[PDB]
Structure formats: C-alpha cells, structure tokens
Design a protein around this motif. Structure first.
Motif, mmCIF file in Angstrom:
data_model
loop_
_atom_site.group_PDB
_atom_site.id
_atom_site.type_symbol
_atom_site.label_atom_id
_atom_site.label_comp_id
_atom_site.label_asym_id
_atom_site.label_seq_id
_atom_site.Cartn_x
_atom_site.Cartn_y
_atom_site.Cartn_z
ATOM 1 N N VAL A 1 7.186 -14.007 6.654
ATOM 2 C CA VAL A 1 6.947 -14.378 8.064
ATOM 3 C C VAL A 1 6.214 -15.731 8.199
ATOM 4 C CG1 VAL A 1 6.973 -11.999 8.999
ATOM 5 C CG2 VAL A 1 4.853 -12.872 8.080
ATOM 6 N N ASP A 2 6.194 -16.319 9.399
ATOM 7 C CA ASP A 2 5.702 -17.687 9.648
ATOM 8 C C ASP A 2 4.569 -17.712 10.692
ATOM 9 O OD1 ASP A 2 5.852 -20.594 9.195
ATOM 10 O OD2 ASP A 2 6.812 -20.720 11.168
ATOM 11 N N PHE A 3 3.342 -17.410 10.252
ATOM 12 C CA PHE A 3 2.138 -17.401 11.096
ATOM 13 C C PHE A 3 1.853 -18.767 11.750
ATOM 14 C CE2 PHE A 3 -2.083 -15.662 12.283
ATOM 15 C CZ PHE A 3 -1.854 -14.276 12.271
ATOM 16 N N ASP A 4 1.088 -18.769 12.843
ATOM 17 C CA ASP A 4 0.681 -19.981 13.567
ATOM 18 C C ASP A 4 -0.185 -20.933 12.701
ATOM 19 O OD1 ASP A 4 0.027 -21.297 16.618
ATOM 20 O OD2 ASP A 4 1.796 -20.000 16.483
ATOM 21 N N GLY A 5 0.458 -21.918 12.060
ATOM 22 C CA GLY A 5 -0.169 -22.995 11.278
ATOM 23 C C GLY A 5 0.174 -23.008 9.779
ATOM 24 N N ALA A 6 0.567 -21.868 9.195
ATOM 25 C CA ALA A 6 0.932 -21.726 7.777
ATOM 26 C C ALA A 6 1.751 -20.434 7.522
ATOM 27 C CB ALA A 6 -0.359 -21.705 6.939
ATOM 28 N N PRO A 7 2.557 -20.357 6.443
ATOM 29 C CA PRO A 7 3.360 -19.175 6.123
ATOM 30 C C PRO A 7 2.506 -17.940 5.787
ATOM 31 C CG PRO A 7 3.495 -20.732 4.287
ATOM 32 C CD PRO A 7 2.798 -21.407 5.464
ATOM 33 N N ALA A 8 3.104 -16.755 5.906
ATOM 34 C CA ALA A 8 2.449 -15.472 5.660
ATOM 35 C C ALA A 8 3.427 -14.406 5.130
ATOM 36 C CB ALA A 8 1.780 -15.025 6.973
ATOM 37 N N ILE A 9 2.884 -13.254 4.743
ATOM 38 C CA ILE A 9 3.641 -12.076 4.300
ATOM 39 C C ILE A 9 3.206 -10.894 5.177
ATOM 40 C CG2 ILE A 9 4.226 -10.613 2.279
ATOM 41 C CD1 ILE A 9 3.388 -12.955 0.453
ATOM 42 N N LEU A 10 4.153 -10.007 5.491
ATOM 43 C CA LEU A 10 3.941 -8.793 6.282
ATOM 44 C C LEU A 10 4.346 -7.588 5.425
ATOM 45 C CD1 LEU A 10 5.114 -8.308 9.995
ATOM 46 C CD2 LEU A 10 3.676 -6.818 8.663
ATOM 47 N N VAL A 11 3.495 -6.565 5.372
ATOM 48 C CA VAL A 11 3.737 -5.314 4.638
ATOM 49 C C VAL A 11 3.354 -4.125 5.512
ATOM 50 C CG1 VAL A 11 1.472 -5.446 3.451
ATOM 51 C CG2 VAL A 11 3.241 -4.063 2.440
ATOM 52 N N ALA A 12 4.169 -3.070 5.499
ATOM 53 C CA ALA A 12 4.008 -1.888 6.345
ATOM 54 C C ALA A 12 3.995 -0.600 5.513
ATOM 55 C CB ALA A 12 5.133 -1.856 7.385
ATOM 56 N N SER A 13 3.135 0.345 5.894
ATOM 57 C CA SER A 13 2.910 1.598 5.169
ATOM 58 C C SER A 13 2.594 2.755 6.117
ATOM 59 C CB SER A 13 1.757 1.412 4.184
ATOM 60 O OG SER A 13 1.666 2.538 3.330
ATOM 61 N N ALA A 14 3.223 3.901 5.867
ATOM 62 C CA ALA A 14 3.009 5.124 6.626
ATOM 63 C C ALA A 14 1.709 5.827 6.205
ATOM 64 C CB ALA A 14 4.225 6.021 6.411
ATOM 65 N N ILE A 15 0.902 6.225 7.190
ATOM 66 C CA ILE A 15 -0.340 6.972 6.969
ATOM 67 C C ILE A 15 0.011 8.459 6.839
ATOM 68 C CG2 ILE A 15 -2.746 7.225 7.626
ATOM 69 C CD1 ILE A 15 -2.450 4.903 9.600
ATOM 70 N N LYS A 16 -0.154 9.025 5.637
ATOM 71 C CA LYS A 16 0.224 10.411 5.300
ATOM 72 C C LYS A 16 -1.016 11.227 4.895
ATOM 73 C CE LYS A 16 4.340 12.825 3.897
ATOM 74 N NZ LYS A 16 4.891 13.669 2.802
ATOM 75 N N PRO A 17 -1.089 12.528 5.235
ATOM 76 C CA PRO A 17 -2.277 13.333 4.969
ATOM 77 C C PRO A 17 -2.457 13.600 3.466
ATOM 78 C CG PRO A 17 -0.565 14.768 5.881
ATOM 79 C CD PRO A 17 -0.075 13.323 5.915
ATOM 80 N N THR A 18 -3.680 13.376 2.977
ATOM 81 C CA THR A 18 -4.131 13.736 1.617
ATOM 82 C C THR A 18 -4.524 15.231 1.538
ATOM 83 O OG1 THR A 18 -5.528 12.909 -0.205
ATOM 84 C CG2 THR A 18 -6.537 12.870 1.953
ATOM 85 N N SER A 19 -5.320 15.632 0.536
ATOM 86 C CA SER A 19 -5.833 16.999 0.292
ATOM 87 C C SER A 19 -4.779 18.124 0.368
ATOM 88 C CB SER A 19 -7.097 17.276 1.128
ATOM 89 O OG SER A 19 -6.851 17.307 2.526
ATOM 90 N N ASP A 20 -3.538 17.802 -0.023
ATOM 91 C CA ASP A 20 -2.349 18.673 0.004
ATOM 92 C C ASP A 20 -2.074 19.362 1.366
ATOM 93 O OD1 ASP A 20 -0.986 21.509 -1.758
ATOM 94 O OD2 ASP A 20 -0.028 19.538 -1.626
ATOM 95 N N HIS A 21 -2.482 18.729 2.475
ATOM 96 C CA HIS A 21 -2.176 19.167 3.843
ATOM 97 C C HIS A 21 -0.663 19.204 4.158
ATOM 98 C CE1 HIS A 21 -6.155 19.840 5.547
ATOM 99 N NE2 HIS A 21 -5.784 19.566 6.811
ATOM 100 N N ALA A 22 -0.309 19.915 5.235
ATOM 101 C CA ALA A 22 1.051 20.005 5.775
ATOM 102 C C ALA A 22 1.655 18.622 6.143
ATOM 103 C CB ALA A 22 0.995 20.927 7.003
#
Length: 208
Positions: free
Chosen positions: A125-146
């Motif tokens: 991606v191309d941020f205002d003034g210099a190039p950048a990177i975008l990364v996305a991740s799903a928030i999933k429950p720990t402690s063996d939850h449903a």
C-alpha cells in the motif's frame, strides 16, 4: 565455466536481499498478529465491539505498542466500518482506506478469509508521504474456548509506513551496499527494484 563474471553475480544477490527484507516484514508482523490476537480479553473487548477504555487503562493495546517491540499502528475493521485507529501511538478519527486512498471493500474480504485458514494475509500500500505494508488477522478465542461466527467476527489490521530511518537496516543489516528510496526518478542504468503494486522504487550502489 570459470571467467570474469562473479562481479555480476553480486548484483543478482543484492536485489534478492532487498526483496527478502520486504518479505521478512510480512512474516515478522503475522507472528505478532497471532500472539496479540490469541487473548480472551482481546476477542471479548474487540469482537463485534470497541471498548478502548480497557485498552488504555491496562495499556494491553494502547500507545505502548510503539515502545514494546510492536508495530507502527493498528486498526479494527468489521462489516464495512472502522471504530479504532491507532496512528503512531495516538487515538484519532481516520480510515485505513483514506490514509493510502486504496479500497477497503476487497481488503475486508481477504481479511475475513484469514480466519478459516488460521493464517494472516498481507499486501502492499501507498501511505501519505512514503510506501507501506498492510496485514490483517482474525481475533480468535484462546484457552480452548468454543468457535465464533467468522463472517461477523472482528478483524485487526496492522500497518507500517517505511521511513528513511529504517532504510539503513533494509540494506546495511542485510549486507547490501548504501541503500535509499528512489522518490520520483529513473536510475542511470544502475541497479534498483520496482516495488509490487506501489509507485515507489528501492535503489542502492553496490560495486561490481
């Protein structure tokens, strides 16, 4: 075969290291995007909601991310909207679409697909003034939850603007020669690397 050609083999390696440095950003960030998403309070306080009072009072997802071996900024997007936008360690009203003018309508689709494969997704991606990177991740429950409904769950996104202070390590720590951004020009038959998707270009001065 053996001749005076090992001088141009060096140029074949120097551009390969500049590509590896950008590949490594994506692979380092996905590793942080799992440890900070595998938390019950993170999924509870960010899942279909935005309780920033917790994130500041405990500092678990506050301005300290810029000074605790974390990333340059953070966003929270779900079902075509945004309600949390940490820009360089500050609370501000802005959109991840606006700061680089790119469309969020397809980044949310690939970001939704991160959950079903237990693996984050990454793009340029191309941020205002210099190039950048975008990364996305799903928030999933720990402690063996449903499990949770992945089409309606929230998705965190991290962002890093590349800056001339980090261009020193993008080549010098990788063993490349003198390393600099090419902002609005064309090299004199010199060695350089056009970035994928963005208009910016990396350049250096390795002696043959």
């Amino acid at each position: 075969g053996s001749a005076r050609h090992q001088d141009d083999i060096a140029i074949e390696q120097s551009h390969f290291y500049v590509e590896k440095a950008l590949q490594n950003r994506r692979e380092n960030s996905e590793q942080f995007s799992t440890t900070y998403s595998f938390w019950t309070d993170a999924y509870v306080y960010l899942g279909n909601r935005v309780d920033a009072d917790w994130a500041f009072t405990k500092n678990n997802l506050g301005s300290v991310l810029y000074t605790t071996n974390g990333y340059d900024g953070v966003f929270v997007i779900d079902d075509r909207g945004t309600r949390y936008a940490m820009l360089e360690g500050e609370l501000s009203e802005r959109s991840l679409a606006d700061s680089l003018n790119a469309d969020t309508g397809d980044i949310l689709r690939s970001a939704r697909r991160a959950a079903v494969d237990e693996a984050a997704i990454s793009r340029y991606v191309d941020f205002d003034g210099a190039p950048a990177i975008l990364v996305a991740s799903a928030i999933k429950p720990t402690s063996d939850h449903a499990p949770i409904d992945l089409a309606k769950a929230s998705v965190m996104v991290f962002v890093d603007r590349l800056t001339p202070a980090k261009l020193a390590k993008l080549g010098g720590d990788y063993g490349i020669a003198n390393l600099h951004l090419l902002a609005g020009g064309a090299a004199g038959d010199k060695e350089s690397l056009a970035l994928e998707g963005t208009p910016h270009r990396l350049a250096w001065v390795s002696s043959r």
